[PDB]
Amino acid sequence: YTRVVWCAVGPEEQKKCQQWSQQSGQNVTCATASTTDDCIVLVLKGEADALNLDGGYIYTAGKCGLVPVLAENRKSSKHSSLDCVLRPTEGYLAVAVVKKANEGLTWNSLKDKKSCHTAVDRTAGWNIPMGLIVNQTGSCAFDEFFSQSCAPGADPKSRLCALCAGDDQGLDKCVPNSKEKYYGYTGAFRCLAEDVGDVAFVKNDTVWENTNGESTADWAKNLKREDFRLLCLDGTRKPVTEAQSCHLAVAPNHAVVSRSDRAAHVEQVLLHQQALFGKNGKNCPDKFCLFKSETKNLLFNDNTECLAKLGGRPTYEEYLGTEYVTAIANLKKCSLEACAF
Ligand SMILES: *[C@@H]1O[C@H](CO)[C@@H](O[C@@H]2O[C@H](CO)[C@@H](O[C@@H]3O[C@H](CO)[C@@H](O[C@H]4O[C@H](CO)[C@@H](O)[C@H](O)[C@@H]4O)[C@H](O)[C@@H]3O)[C@H](O)[C@H]2NC(C)=O)[C@H](O)[C@H]1NC(C)=O
Ligand SMILES: *[C@@H]1O[C@H](CO)[C@@H](O[C@@H]2O[C@H](CO)[C@@H](O[C@H]3O[C@H](CO)[C@@H](O[C@@H]4O[C@H](CO)[C@@H](O)[C@H](O)[C@@H]4O)[C@H](O)[C@@H]3O)[C@H](O)[C@H]2NC(C)=O)[C@H](O)[C@H]1NC(C)=O
Ligand SMILES: *[C@@H]1O[C@H](CO)[C@@H](O[C@@H]2O[C@H](CO)[C@@H](O)[C@H](O)[C@H]2NC(C)=O)[C@H](O)[C@H]1NC(C)=O
Numbered sequence: 461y462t463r464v465v466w467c468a469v470g471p472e473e474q475k476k477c478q479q480w481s482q483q484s485g486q487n488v489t490c491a492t493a494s495t496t497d498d499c500i501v502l503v504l505k506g507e508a509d510a511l512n513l514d515g516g517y518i519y520t521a522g523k524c525g526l527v528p529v530l531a532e533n534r535k536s537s538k539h540s541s542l543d544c545v546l547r548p549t550e551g552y553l554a555v556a557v558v559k560k561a562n563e564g565l566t567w568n569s570l571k572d573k574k575s576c577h578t579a580v581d582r583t584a585g586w587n588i589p590m591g592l593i594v595n596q597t598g599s600c601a602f603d604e605f606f607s608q609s610c611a612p613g614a615d616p617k618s619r620l621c622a623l624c625a626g627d628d629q630g631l632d633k634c635v636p637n638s639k640e641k642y643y644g645y646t647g648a649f650r651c652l653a654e655d656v657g658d659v660a661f662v663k664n665d666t667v668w669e670n671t672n673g674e675s676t677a678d679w680a681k682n683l684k685r686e687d688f689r690l691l692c693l694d695g696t697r698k699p700v701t702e703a704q705s706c707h708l709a710v711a712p713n714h715a716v717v718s719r720s721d722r723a724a725h726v727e728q729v730l731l732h733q734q735a736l737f738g739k740n741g742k743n744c745p746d747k748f749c750l751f752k753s754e755t756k757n758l759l760f761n762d763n764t765e766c767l768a769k770l771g772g773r774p775t776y777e778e779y780l781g782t783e784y785v786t787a788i789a790n791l792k793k794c795s796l797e798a799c800a801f
């Protein structure tokens with residue numbers, strides 16, 4: 461009845477889960493997969509219960525029947541009376557970041573540049589940017605737009621993986637999990653920070669969180685916000701402070717999904733779980749904090765205040781919103797109902 465099997469993607473997420481498992485008294489157990497799609501398959505088979513996913517994957521998991529349970533909620537200023545769990549989710553800003561020193565580089569001069577994406581099939585890292593690009597370009601050849609990139613998930617032998625590093629030994633090149641040096645939000649930003657790429661498609665919180673001595677990580681402590689700029693769709697360039705007036709789209713928050721016949725139990729165990737290891741949980745700072753991993757966004761983004769109820773018991777198409785759902789469909793015509801498994 462009351463035991464949840466979380467699905468960890470890769471070795472770094474597995475050790476944070478095992479610690480979560482340790483401290484839960486087996487109330488939460490861990491399964492491990494090499495990629496997100498594999499974690500979705502384990503959840504379908506019934507061998508795993510849930511995992512926190514980006515909107516890009518929610519579309520996939522949704523076509524295969526999985527349903528959104530709880531969502532991630534970060535620090536907010538509007539809706540200050542409401543409790544984090546009952547408080548609506550605001551979504552997040554997908555942006556195109558570049559180096560200030562890289563003058564002349566604008567949304568219209570991206571052709572043949574070098575790119576950094578969080579990973580294939582994700583919202584801000586792939587779906588939004590490329591969807592805009594296919595559209596504007598009137599072509600599906602998105603694999604020939606940038607000279608080279610690091611889009612975790614693409615074929616290792618392709619130019620879309622050309623800029624990925626792999627792990628400490630150089631193995632697992634381009635794999636879509638934390639083992640890839642430039643995987644995910646942080647990885648992609650680093651990919652720009654180290655000047656490996658000309659532009660990185662992440663979200664706005666990513667810039668703030670890793671600049672101005674906010675990260676302390678070898679490659680980030682000396683990074684200053686003013687050395688970065690945002691590419692707007694009007695061909696303009698703006699400071700990272702003008703995010704609301706220069707973003708590619710507003711992405712729906714990452715959320716925990718599960719098979720519909722388990723959602724009620726996955727939802728209950730988690731709410732309780734976060735009462736213990738959440739932001740102001742009984743044992744978070746002292747023993748274990750679910751929403752902390754040191755700027756590595758393991759299992760959940762570090763900026764999460766809490767996981768929140770949904771309200772309107774949404775289906776995946778509703779949670780993601782018709783806006784974004786069409787975006788993905790139009791782009792997928794390039795690579796129409798079914799679910800890839
Ligand atoms: C890439 O280009 C594709 C081709 O143009 C885009 O696909 C189309 O996307 C549009 C919008 O995303 C879809 O059209 C409509 O959008 C309207 C706006 O929401 C909807 O109607 C609404 O308008 C009235 C206005 O009076 C409002 O009052 C009302 O409240 C409502 O919100 C329509 O219902 C409809 O969706 C269209 O379906 C897509 N067309 C095709 C051929 O698929 C695609 O989005 C672009 N991709 C990206 C990422 O930008
Ligand atoms: C781009 O990305 C950044 C980070 O993702 C976005 O925002 C940040 O703004 C948040 C607020 O929306 C910040 O959290 C808040 O944290 C403190 C305390 O927790 C706030 O102090 C305040 O406390 C007094 C007490 O009365 C009150 O006035 C309020 O309660 C108020 O909350 C704090 O000022 C801040 O708002 C966070 O600090 C900040 N991130 C960083 C690293 O600076 C940013 O909004 C975003 N751009 C856009 C367009 O969203
Ligand atoms: C394990 O999960 C359960 C369920 O949330 C918690 O254990 C129990 O404690 C509460 C309050 O005393 C009871 O309502 C349950 O029936 C208890 N279960 C039993 C019989 O042991 C517990 O908080 C979780 N354990 C840890 C370590 O967090």
Ligand SMILES: OC[C@H]1O[C@](O)(CO)[C@@H](O)[C@@H]1O
Nearest residue numbers: 549550551710712779780781
């Ligand atoms: O950011 C916009 C997103 O948030 C909502 O308005 C509310 O939860 C969603 O339907 C949409 O996807």
Ligand SMILES: [Fe+3]
Nearest residue numbers: 514515583584
């Ligand atoms: Fe995302």
Ligand SMILES: [Zn+2]
Nearest residue numbers: 707708709710
């Ligand atoms: Zn907007």
Ligand SMILES: [Zn+2]
Nearest residue numbers: 773774775778
């Ligand atoms: Zn509904």
